[PDB]
Every structure is written in structure tokens, then in C-alpha cells.
mmCIF file with all atom_site columns, C-alpha atoms in Angstrom:
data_model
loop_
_atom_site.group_PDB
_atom_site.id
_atom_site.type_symbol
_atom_site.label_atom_id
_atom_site.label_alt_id
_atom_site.label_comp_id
_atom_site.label_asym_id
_atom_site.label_entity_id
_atom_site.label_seq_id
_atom_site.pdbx_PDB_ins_code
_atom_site.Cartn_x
_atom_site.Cartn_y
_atom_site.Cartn_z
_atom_site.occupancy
_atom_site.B_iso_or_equiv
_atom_site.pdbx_formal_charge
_atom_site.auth_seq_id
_atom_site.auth_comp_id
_atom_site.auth_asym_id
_atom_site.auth_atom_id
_atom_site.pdbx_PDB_model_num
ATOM 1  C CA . UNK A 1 1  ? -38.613 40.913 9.385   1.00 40.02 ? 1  UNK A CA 1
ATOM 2  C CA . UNK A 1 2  ? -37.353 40.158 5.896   1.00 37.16 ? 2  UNK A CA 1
ATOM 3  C CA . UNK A 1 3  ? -35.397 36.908 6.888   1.00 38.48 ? 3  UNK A CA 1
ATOM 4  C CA . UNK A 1 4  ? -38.260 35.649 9.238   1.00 37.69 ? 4  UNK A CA 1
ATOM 5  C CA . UNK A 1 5  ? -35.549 34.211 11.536  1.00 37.31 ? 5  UNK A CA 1
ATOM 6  C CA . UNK A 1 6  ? -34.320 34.472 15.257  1.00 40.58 ? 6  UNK A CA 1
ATOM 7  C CA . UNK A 1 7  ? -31.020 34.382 16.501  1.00 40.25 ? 7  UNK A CA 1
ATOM 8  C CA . UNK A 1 8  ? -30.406 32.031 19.846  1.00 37.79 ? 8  UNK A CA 1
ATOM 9  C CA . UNK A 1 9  ? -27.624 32.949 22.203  1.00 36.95 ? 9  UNK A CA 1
ATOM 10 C CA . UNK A 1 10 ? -25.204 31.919 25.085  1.00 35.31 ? 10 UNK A CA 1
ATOM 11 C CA . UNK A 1 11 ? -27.556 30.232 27.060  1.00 35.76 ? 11 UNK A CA 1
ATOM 12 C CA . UNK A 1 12 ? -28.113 26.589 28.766  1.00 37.20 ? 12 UNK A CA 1
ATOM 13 C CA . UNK A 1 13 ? -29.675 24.932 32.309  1.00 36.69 ? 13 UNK A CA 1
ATOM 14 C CA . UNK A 1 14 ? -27.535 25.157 34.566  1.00 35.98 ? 14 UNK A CA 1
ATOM 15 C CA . UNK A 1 15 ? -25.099 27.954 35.978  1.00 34.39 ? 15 UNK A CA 1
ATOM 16 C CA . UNK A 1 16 ? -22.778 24.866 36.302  1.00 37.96 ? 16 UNK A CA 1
ATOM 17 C CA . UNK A 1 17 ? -22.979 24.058 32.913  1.00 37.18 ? 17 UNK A CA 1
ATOM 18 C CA . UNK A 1 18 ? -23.191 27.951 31.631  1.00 38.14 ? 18 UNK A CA 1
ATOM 19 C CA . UNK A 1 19 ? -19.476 28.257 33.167  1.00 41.08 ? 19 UNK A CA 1
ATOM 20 C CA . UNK A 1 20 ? -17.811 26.561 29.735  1.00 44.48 ? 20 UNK A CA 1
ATOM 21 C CA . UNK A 1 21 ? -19.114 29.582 27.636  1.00 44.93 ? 21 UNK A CA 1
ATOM 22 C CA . UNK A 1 22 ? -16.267 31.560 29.083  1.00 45.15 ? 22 UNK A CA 1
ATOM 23 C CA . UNK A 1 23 ? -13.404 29.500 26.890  1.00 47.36 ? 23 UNK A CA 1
ATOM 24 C CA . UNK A 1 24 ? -15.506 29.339 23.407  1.00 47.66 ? 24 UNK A CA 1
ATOM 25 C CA . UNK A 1 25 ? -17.653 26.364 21.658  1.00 47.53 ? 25 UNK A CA 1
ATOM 26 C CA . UNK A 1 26 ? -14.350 24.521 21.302  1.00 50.99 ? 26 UNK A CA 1
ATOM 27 C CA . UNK A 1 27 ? -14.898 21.978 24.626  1.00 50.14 ? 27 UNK A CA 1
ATOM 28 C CA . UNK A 1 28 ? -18.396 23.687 25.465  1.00 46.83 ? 28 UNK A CA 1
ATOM 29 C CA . UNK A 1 29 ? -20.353 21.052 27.122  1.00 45.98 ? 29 UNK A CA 1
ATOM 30 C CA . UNK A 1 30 ? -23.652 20.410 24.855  1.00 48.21 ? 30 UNK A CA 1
ATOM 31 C CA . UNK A 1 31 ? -25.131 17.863 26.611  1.00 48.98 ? 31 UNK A CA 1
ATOM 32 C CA . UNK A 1 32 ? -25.373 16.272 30.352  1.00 49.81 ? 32 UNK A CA 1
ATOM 33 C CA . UNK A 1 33 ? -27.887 13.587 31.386  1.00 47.34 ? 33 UNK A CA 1
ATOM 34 C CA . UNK A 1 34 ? -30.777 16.428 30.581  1.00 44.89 ? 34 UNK A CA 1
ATOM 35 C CA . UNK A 1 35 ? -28.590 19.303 31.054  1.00 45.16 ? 35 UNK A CA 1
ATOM 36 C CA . UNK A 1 36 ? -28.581 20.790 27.388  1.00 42.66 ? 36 UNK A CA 1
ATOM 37 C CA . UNK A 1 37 ? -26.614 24.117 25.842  1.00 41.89 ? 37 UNK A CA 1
ATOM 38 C CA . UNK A 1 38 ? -27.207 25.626 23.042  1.00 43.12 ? 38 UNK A CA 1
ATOM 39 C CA . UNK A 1 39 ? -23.919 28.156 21.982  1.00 44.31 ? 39 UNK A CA 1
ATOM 40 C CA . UNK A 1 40 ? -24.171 31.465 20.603  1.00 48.00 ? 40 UNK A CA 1
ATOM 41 C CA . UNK A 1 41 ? -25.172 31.208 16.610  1.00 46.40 ? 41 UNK A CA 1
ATOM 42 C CA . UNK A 1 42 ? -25.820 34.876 15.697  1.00 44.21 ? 42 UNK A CA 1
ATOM 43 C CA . UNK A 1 43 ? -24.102 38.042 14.009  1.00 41.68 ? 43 UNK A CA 1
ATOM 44 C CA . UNK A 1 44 ? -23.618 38.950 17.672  1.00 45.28 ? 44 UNK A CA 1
ATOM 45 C CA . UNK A 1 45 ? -21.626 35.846 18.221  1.00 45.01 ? 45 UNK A CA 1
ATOM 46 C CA . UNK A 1 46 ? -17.707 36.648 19.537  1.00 47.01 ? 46 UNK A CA 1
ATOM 47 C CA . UNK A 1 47 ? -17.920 40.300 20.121  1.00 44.27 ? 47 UNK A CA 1
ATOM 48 C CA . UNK A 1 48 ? -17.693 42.458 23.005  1.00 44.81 ? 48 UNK A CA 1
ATOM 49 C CA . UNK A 1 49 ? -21.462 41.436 25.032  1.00 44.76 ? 49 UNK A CA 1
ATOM 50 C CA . UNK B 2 1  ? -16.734 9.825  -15.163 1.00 42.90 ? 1  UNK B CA 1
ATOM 51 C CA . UNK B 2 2  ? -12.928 9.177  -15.394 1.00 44.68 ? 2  UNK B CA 1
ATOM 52 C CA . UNK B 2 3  ? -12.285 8.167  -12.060 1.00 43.91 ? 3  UNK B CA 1
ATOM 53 C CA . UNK B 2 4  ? -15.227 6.169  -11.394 1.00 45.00 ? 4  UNK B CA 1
ATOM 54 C CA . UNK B 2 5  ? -14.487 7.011  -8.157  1.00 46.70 ? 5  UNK B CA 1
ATOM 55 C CA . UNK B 2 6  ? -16.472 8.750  -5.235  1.00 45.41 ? 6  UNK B CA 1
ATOM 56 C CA . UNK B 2 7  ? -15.422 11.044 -2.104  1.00 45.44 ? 7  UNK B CA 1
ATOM 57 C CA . UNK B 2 8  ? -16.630 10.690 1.474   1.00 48.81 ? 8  UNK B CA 1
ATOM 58 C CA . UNK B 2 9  ? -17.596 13.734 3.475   1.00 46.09 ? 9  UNK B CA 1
ATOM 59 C CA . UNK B 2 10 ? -17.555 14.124 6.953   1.00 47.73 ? 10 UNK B CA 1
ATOM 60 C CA . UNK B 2 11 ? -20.225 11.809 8.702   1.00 46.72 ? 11 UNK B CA 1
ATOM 61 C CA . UNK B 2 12 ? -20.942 9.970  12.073  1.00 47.25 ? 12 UNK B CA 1
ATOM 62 C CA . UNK B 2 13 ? -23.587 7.772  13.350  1.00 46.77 ? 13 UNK B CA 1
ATOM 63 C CA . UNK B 2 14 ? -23.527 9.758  16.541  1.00 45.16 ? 14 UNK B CA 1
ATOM 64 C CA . UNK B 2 15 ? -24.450 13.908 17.002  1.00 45.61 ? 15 UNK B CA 1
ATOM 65 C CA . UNK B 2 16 ? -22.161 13.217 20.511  1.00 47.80 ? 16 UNK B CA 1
ATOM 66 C CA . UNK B 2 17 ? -19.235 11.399 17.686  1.00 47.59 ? 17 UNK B CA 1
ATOM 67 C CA . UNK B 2 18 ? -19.718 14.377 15.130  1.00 49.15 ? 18 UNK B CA 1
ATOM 68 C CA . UNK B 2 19 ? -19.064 17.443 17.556  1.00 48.28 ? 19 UNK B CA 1
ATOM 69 C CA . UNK B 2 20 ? -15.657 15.979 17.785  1.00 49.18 ? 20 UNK B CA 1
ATOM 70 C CA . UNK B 2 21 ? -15.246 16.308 14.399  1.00 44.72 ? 21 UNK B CA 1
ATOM 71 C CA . UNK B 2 22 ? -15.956 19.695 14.124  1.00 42.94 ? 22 UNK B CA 1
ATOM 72 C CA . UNK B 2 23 ? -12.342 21.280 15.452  1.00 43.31 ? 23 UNK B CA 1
ATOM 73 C CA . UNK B 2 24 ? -10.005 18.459 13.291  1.00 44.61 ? 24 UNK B CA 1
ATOM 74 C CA . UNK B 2 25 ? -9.259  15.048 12.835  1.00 43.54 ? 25 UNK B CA 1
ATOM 75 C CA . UNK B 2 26 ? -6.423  15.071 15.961  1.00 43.55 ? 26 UNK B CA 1
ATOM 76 C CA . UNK B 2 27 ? -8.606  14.502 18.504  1.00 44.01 ? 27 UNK B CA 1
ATOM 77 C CA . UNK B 2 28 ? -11.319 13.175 16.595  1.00 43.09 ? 28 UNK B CA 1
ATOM 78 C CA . UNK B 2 29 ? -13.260 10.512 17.881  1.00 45.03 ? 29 UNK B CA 1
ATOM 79 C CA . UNK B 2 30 ? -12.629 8.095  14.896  1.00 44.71 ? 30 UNK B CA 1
ATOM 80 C CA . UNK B 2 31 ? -15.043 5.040  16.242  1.00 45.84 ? 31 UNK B CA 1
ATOM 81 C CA . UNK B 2 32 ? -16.933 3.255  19.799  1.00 45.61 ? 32 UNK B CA 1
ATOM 82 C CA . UNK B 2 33 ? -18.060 0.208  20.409  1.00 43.60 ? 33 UNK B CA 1
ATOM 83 C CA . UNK B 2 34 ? -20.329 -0.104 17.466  1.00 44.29 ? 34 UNK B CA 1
ATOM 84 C CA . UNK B 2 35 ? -20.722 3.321  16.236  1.00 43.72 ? 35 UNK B CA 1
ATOM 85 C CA . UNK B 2 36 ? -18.668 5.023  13.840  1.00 44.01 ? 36 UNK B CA 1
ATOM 86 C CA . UNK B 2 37 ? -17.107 8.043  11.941  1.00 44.28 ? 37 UNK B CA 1
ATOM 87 C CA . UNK B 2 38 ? -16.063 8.778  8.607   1.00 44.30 ? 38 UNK B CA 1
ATOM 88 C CA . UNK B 2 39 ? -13.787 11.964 8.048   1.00 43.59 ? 39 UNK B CA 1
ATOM 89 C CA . UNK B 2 40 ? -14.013 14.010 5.445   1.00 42.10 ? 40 UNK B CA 1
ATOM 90 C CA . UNK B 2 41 ? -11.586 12.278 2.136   1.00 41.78 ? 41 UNK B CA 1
ATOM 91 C CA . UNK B 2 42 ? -12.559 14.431 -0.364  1.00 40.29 ? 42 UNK B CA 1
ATOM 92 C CA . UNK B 2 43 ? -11.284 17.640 -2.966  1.00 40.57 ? 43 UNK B CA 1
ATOM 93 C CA . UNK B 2 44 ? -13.584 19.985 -0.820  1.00 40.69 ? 44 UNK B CA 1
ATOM 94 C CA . UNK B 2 45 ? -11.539 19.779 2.307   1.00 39.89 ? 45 UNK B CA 1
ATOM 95 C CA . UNK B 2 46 ? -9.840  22.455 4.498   1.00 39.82 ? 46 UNK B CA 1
ATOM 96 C CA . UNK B 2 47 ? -12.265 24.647 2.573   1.00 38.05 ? 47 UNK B CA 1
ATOM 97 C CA . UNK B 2 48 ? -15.471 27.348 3.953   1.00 32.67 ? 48 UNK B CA 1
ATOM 98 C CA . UNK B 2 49 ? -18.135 25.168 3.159   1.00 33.76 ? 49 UNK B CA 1
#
């Protein structure tokens, strides 16, 4: 409420490309043909869940 | 004003050429066929920001 902001998360479009969260943003796959990620920016971001 | 010199930051012609950059210049995608990179040469490098 006071930043007026929103966090995104682990999340992409395919389970085939979700499976290179599991090893960090260092070789995360961004982008295929159409098939985009976006990584985990947040405070959340490296911790437990 | 003494130097009359001027530092280059870390830019790319390509958002696919400048994730590469992001981890060090090792493995750094330096250039393609006609697009290009320019690593950081600068006083603020190795820093936070």
C-alpha cells in the first residue's frame, strides 16, 4: 500500500521450461520461441518457499 | 576535466547479449554477427550498483 508495487515470482509457460528454476537465475532459460520466464524479483526471493 | 577522458558502462545491442553479461565477463558473450557488447571499463566496477 505505501510503495504501490507488486512483487512477480518463480513463474513461466511451460512445466518444461519451469524445470531451470530449481538451479537459480544463473542459466535460467528467459526466453524460447514464445516460451517466456520471468524469475523471482521479490523480498521473498532465495528463501525457504 | 583532467582526463578528458570518459568510461563505458556495461551495454549491449541485444537483451538476449546483455543477460550474459550479468554473471561476468568469462563467459560473456562479447559480440555476433553484427551485434555487439561493451563491458563495463569504468571506476564503478565490481561495485553494488
Amino acid at each position: 500500500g505505501l510503495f504501490q508495487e507488486a512483487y512477480p515470482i518463480t513463474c513461466a509457460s511451460d512445466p518444461a521450461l519451469l524445470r531451470s528454476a530449481r538451479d537459480g537465475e544463473a542459466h535460467a532459460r528467459e526466453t524460447h520461441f514464445t516460451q517466456y520466464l520471468i524469475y523471482d524479483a521479490s523480498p521473498l526471493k532465495g528463501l525457504s518457499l
